[PDB]
């Protein structure tokens, strides 16, 4: 009666009490929609038939100020995974320590810029300092939601299309890796998602560390599914991030992509027998500053 | 701490960066020699895994053989373009250190480009590359050390542990050689045995050596000036060398044909490392080969294909990432110079060995692939029973478990205190490349000290 | 002409039906006994390809072990339900007839079920097959006829061959044996050579088995009566039979493991065919296994998985094909009953090949696998030379071309007018399962007559 849950590279999938399974899971951020409606749209996923969910936690939520932590009502992320576990669904956590998600700065909290030359997402040393601390905060609050110890907790994120960002350090991942291995243990699967084209692979995935891409209905699937085997050549192939849609910007019209053709994408991928997640399967709320930006500078609405 | 300058960005190649760290540069090796090290960190707790020194043989062969192709942590796939993991590399649970030695092979060099030199300067740029390490790696000098090498490392580590004896410094825990040349004499007579015992001799050759290279049960294959003595072992040094055997493996397969044409191409590949039958008298066919201008030549292991780690180190993406400079020429597996110019001195190992056996601070095994003749473990077996020590477990076979396929023998054991035998069933010279999983379970178990 | 009656219609599990006629049926034994036969025609010309028949060993083991799992027409797979042609068979150059003897073996059987036999019974038997088969099959007795066999067949083919010689109607034109036990005592003292050259016995054993079991420069290893000398010979086999070395392939795994539980079920399985050491004085372990009702025994081989051949010969719809009486109980590669009831006759086969060498008119070829211990090379060598023939060639090495790899070699080859020593480099008791092109290049050459 173990949870016994891990990789199976012979069979290409994973395995839950040694039996073959792969996920059909949906985002949705707890943050972006009031705790009020948290069962709400976790119920409406359930129903939709999704095992799994797949969720950031931006770190900029929880430690607005440096050593302050918000965890309780409105804060209470582990009261949102105890919930999802309740309903029955399975959780997959991205904890960062970016999440990009048209969320404000990454999830990184604005007061690390008080040193003023810093570098994020790099070795920096003040920065892995500080990811660090969050990680050793953030983590034993998740250590006892993880499968293995009976939580929902299947997969964890490391990063989020690392592959895009100028820096290309596999020291920094390296960093990263151990820390979640030492607070989480190795029974943790741990994961990467990138961009479905191999140079963002190549500078995004990690021995290790499983490596998975994203990418929407405008994409070759057999060359993206292609694309993540030469980085795995085997177990399941993942789209960690399959859009279903697309964000907006205020002035650029809303962005619409029809039903159907998602749909008829989904079933293509599902008939390769692949994990897939639909991002976003709720988007919820930008509230007062959580919006994030690009460049060259386009904020994102209230709407999400 | 560590030489940022050193680190290594990227690796060309390889899919997915390696989850520890990695270092290549160069160790202050006799001023203007500089030996090329290559670091690789153990995949989990590298601050606390035990430092294990790497060197191959030769004399003139690079240590990047046993990490690129034996037990590193990444091997070159047949494309010699892409790089796979290696379950069974030795970086698993060890930080180990791979050096280049001595200068002029592989990467290493000299300011004076005086590639000839000899035990003794190799064994003190050994040790001077040591401490240079230390020096620039101190977070490691509390590390548990390790030598260990093969072939003809076999010479080159006891010597040089004679050296690390004296560094208080430097925290000898044990030493480990695969397939070594103990010695001349025991080598060549166990390899005539050896040859005879694996149908490689025949009677008829048989008869004439006992007759003419023998007294009664004391054969001399060593220095043996009996005339048709001498010709029967030139027999069995052409059957050896050039007749189509490996002697790395002799169940194993020629990497495209010995016995066939000499070359395809001018470039000569030459295969006698000059440390079996150095007291008998050869043809000098050296000679006859051209000596002509652009007459390139190069040393590569026979029936092996040095072609995939040659394509990867000398790839100018890879030589960039490896920090190595542009100046130096073309790579090899074995530097062919190097080989024709090294002065061997030592003749046995036994005044080594007995120097490390009198501390009784060390664990000691040396292991041997049982289809070697370069070095067969049976040479290595006598010279371990010639060393006449306390027995402490009666030789027995000892055992290594397979996923879901029960229980196999991987070699026999010989325990005596503070040095052990043990033999690998199935491997070659290259131990790790014919037995991947055996070698790893033998060497975890000797770095952990755990008795088998 | 031939028999419809024991014509194959198919093979159950094969995808695509053979394209040469196959027969599977009885031969005349003594009037009790009817052996089991499985002719299988060649894929090229059958109508003048000659015939070759083959014979495995024990004694009490079915020659349908040849074909099914080494040079058959078809190869069963792991699942044991699929059938693969096999690019290195045998039948791709010659129609080849495998015989299942003695009665009781496999699908043979008696009348009175009278298991138990002896040499010159089993000669007989043999000799009374192949006549019925020529009288069954008339077209094939102007083919060139070949006696063909393994491990125990090393006694049977000669002896039988004495009877081929006596029969005009028979076209005699060679013999080969593989890895067969030309004698006992030559077998004995090459087994305990081989054992100390290859790391089995170690140096104080070495040394106590020249003590105790030798003259200066002879050595007795098979009726020796010294007590220690006796002593280390059990120790010997001991090592040899359970302590986790395949007797067959010394490189090679050991299926599900020996050295683990003796059985997981009621189901015994016994490896001692009792033809090594069989002056020694053995340790009564037969008597200790339960003799109770329902106790079921078999003999396999060492270390080998029988499961699929056994899975396959005995599926209802294959046994249905093959026209095998429902009556017979189920199906075993060896026979534990009749290798107990076996009676040894011949010591050694000294005066068998004396006979056939002087006739001169046949060619014959001994070829043994340098990785066996239960009929080493070294033994069959020691016998061929002691057989004392003029040389027509000395001892050298013989080549095999791979796909695109160039030359390799396979072994080495004595000939001396009409008889020849080979060696399979690589190969074990089963030559064809190690080396199968090999084999294959080997077997055509000999057969074809063409020298190496
Ligand atoms: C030693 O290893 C090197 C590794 O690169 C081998 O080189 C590779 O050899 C293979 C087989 O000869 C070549 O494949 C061939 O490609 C041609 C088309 O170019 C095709 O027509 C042939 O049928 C075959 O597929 C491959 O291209 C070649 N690659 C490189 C980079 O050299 C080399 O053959 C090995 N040699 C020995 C003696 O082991
Ligand atoms: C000897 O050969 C026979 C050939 O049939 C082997 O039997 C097969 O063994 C494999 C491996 O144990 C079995 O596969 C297993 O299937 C189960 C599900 O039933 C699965 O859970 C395991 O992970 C594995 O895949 C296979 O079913 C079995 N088939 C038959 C017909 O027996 C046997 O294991 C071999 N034994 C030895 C000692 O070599
Ligand atoms: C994707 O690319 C593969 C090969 O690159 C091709 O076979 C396949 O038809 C393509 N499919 C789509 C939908 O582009
Ligand atoms: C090795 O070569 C150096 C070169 O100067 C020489 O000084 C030294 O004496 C040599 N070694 C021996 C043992 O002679
Ligand atoms: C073999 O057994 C038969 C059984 O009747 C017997 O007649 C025969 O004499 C035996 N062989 C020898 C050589 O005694």
């Given at each position: 009666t173990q949870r016994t849950f891990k990789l199976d590279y012979s069979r290409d999938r994973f395995l839950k009490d040694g039996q073959p399974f792969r996920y059909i899971s949906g985002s949705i951020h707890y943050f972006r929609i009031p705790r009020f409606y948290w069962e709400d749209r976790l119920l409406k996923m359930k129903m939709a038939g999704l095992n799994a969910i797949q969720m950031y936690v931006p770190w900029n939520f929880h430690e607005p100020q440096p050593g302050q932590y918000e965890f309780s009502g409105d804060r209470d992320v582990?009261?949102?995974?105890?919930?999802?576990?309740?309903?029955?669904?399975?959780?997959?956590?991205?904890?960062?320590?970016?999440?990009?998600?048209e969320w404000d700065m990454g999830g990184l909290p604005a007061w690390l810029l008080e040193k003023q030359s810093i570098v994020l997402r790099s070795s920096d040393p003040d920065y892995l300092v500080a990811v660090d601390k969050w990680l050793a905060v953030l983590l034993p609050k998740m250590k006892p939601l993880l499968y293995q110890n009976g939580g929902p907790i299947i997969t964890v994120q490391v990063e989020n299309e690392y592959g895009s960002y100028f820096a290309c350090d596999y020291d920094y991942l390296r960093f990263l890796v151990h820390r979640f291995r030492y607070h989480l243990g190795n029974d943790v699967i741990l994961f990467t998602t990138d961009g479905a084209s191999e140079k963002m692979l190549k500078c995004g995935t990690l021995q290790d560390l499983y490596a998975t891409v994203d990418f929407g209905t405008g994409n070759n699937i057999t060359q993206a599914f292609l694309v993540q085997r030469k980085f795995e050549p085997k177990g399941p192939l993942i789209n960690s991030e399959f859009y279903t849609g697309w964000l907006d910007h205020w002035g650029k019209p809303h962005s619409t992509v029809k039903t159907k053709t998602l749909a008829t994408s989904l079933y293509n991928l599902l008939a390769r027998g692949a994990n897939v997640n639909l991002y976003m399967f709720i988007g919820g709320t930008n509230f007062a500053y959580w919006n994030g930006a690009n460049t060259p500078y386009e904020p994102q609405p209230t709407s999400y | 701490?560590?030489?940022?300058?050193?680190?290594?960005?990227?690796?060309?190649?390889?899919?997915?960066?390696?989850?520890?760290?990695?270092?290549?540069?160069?160790?202050?090796?006799?001023?203007?020699?500089?030996?090329?090290?290559?670091?690789?960190?153990?995949?989990?707790?590298?601050?606390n895994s035990p430092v294990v020194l790497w060197l191959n043989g030769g004399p003139g062969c690079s240590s990047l053989d046993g990490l690129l192709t034996e037990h590193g942590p990444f091997l070159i796939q047949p494309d010699g373009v892409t790089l796979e993991y290696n379950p069974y590399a030795w970086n698993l649970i060890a930080n180990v250190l791979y050096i280049e030695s001595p200068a002029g092979v592989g990467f290493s060099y000299s300011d004076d480009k005086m590639y000839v030199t000899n035990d003794t300067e190799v064994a003190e740029n050994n040790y001077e590359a040591l401490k240079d390490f230390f020096r620039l790696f101190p977070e490691y000098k509390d590390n548990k050390l390790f030598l260990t090498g093969e072939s003809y490392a076999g010479i080159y580590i006891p010597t040089l542990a004679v050296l690390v004896m004296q560094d208080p410094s430097m925290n000898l825990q044990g030493l480990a050689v695969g397939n070594g040349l103990?010695?001349?004499?025991?080598?060549?007579?166990?390899?005539?045995?050896?040859?005879?015992?694996?149908?490689?001799?025949?009677?008829?050759?048989?008869?004439?050596?006992?007759?003419?290279?023998?007294?009664?049960?004391?054969?001399?294959?060593?220095?043996?000036?009996?005339?048709?003595?001498?010709?029967?072992?030139?027999?069995?040094?052409?059957?050896?060398?050039?007749?189509?055997?490996?002697?790395?493996?002799?169940?194993?397969?020629?990497?495209?044909?010995?016995?066939?044409?000499?070359?395809?191409?001018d470039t000569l590949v030459v295969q006698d490392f000059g440390n079996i039958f150095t007291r008998l008298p050869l043809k000098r066919r050296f000679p006859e080969?051209?000596?002509?201008?652009?007459?390139?030549?190069?040393?590569?292991?026979?029936?092996?294909?040095?072609?995939?780690?040659?394509?990867?180190?000398?790839?100018?993406?890879?030589?960039?990432?490896?920090?190595?400079?542009?100046?130096?020429?073309?790579?090899?597996?074995?530097?062919?110079?190097?080989?024709?110019?090294?002065?061997?001195?030592?003749?046995?190992?036994?005044?080594?060995?007995?120097?490390?056996?009198?501390?009784?601070?060390?664990?000691?095994?040396?292991?041997?692939?049982?289809?070697?003749?370069?070095?067969?473990?049976?040479?290595?077996?006598?010279?371990?029973?010639?060393?006449?020590?306390?027995?402490?477990?009666?030789?027995?076979?000892?055992?290594?478990?397979?996923?879901?396929?029960?229980?196999?023998?991987?070699?026999?054991?010989?325990?005596?205190?503070?040095?052990?035998?043990?033999?690998?069933?199935?491997?070659?010279?290259?131990?790790?490349?014919?037995?991947?999983?055996?070698?790893?379970?033998?060497?975890?178990?000797?770095?952990?000290?755990?008795?088998?």
């Open positions: 582990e009261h949102f995974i105890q919930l999802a576990h309740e309903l029955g669904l399975l959780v997959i956590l991205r904890p960062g320590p970016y999440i990009c998600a | 701490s560590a030489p940022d300058q050193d680190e290594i960005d990227a690796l060309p190649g390889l899919a997915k960066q390696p989850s520890f760290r990695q270092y290549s540069g160069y160790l202050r090796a006799s001023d203007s020699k500089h030996f090329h090290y290559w670091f690789v960190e153990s995949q989990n707790d590298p601050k103990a010695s001349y004499e025991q080598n060549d007579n166990s390899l005539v045995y050896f040859a005879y015992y694996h149908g490689l001799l025949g009677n008829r050759l048989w008869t004439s050596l006992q007759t003419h290279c023998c007294a009664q049960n004391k054969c001399n294959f060593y220095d043996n000036k009996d005339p048709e003595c001498v010709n029967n072992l030139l027999e069995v040094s052409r059957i050896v060398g050039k007749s189509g055997l490996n002697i790395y493996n002799l169940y194993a397969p020629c990497a495209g044909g010995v016995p066939g044409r000499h070359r395809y191409e080969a051209l000596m002509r201008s652009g007459d390139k030549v190069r040393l590569d292991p026979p029936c092996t294909n040095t072609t995939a780690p040659s394509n990867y180190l000398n790839n100018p993406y890879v030589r960039k990432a490896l920090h190595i400079p542009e100046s130096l020429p073309r790579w090899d597996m074995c530097n062919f110079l190097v080989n024709l110019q090294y002065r061997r001195l030592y003749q046995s190992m036994n005044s080594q060995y007995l120097k490390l056996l009198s501390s009784q601070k060390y664990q000691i095994l040396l292991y041997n692939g049982d289809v070697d003749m370069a070095c067969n473990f049976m040479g290595d077996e006598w010279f371990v029973d010639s060393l006449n020590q306390k027995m402490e477990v009666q030789r027995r076979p000892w055992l290594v478990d397979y996923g879901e396929s029960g229980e196999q023998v991987a070699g026999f054991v010989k325990e005596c205190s503070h040095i052990t035998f043990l033999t690998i069933k199935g491997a070659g010279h290259m131990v790790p490349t014919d037995k991947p999983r055996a070698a790893f379970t033998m060497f975890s178990r000797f770095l952990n000290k755990e008795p088998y």
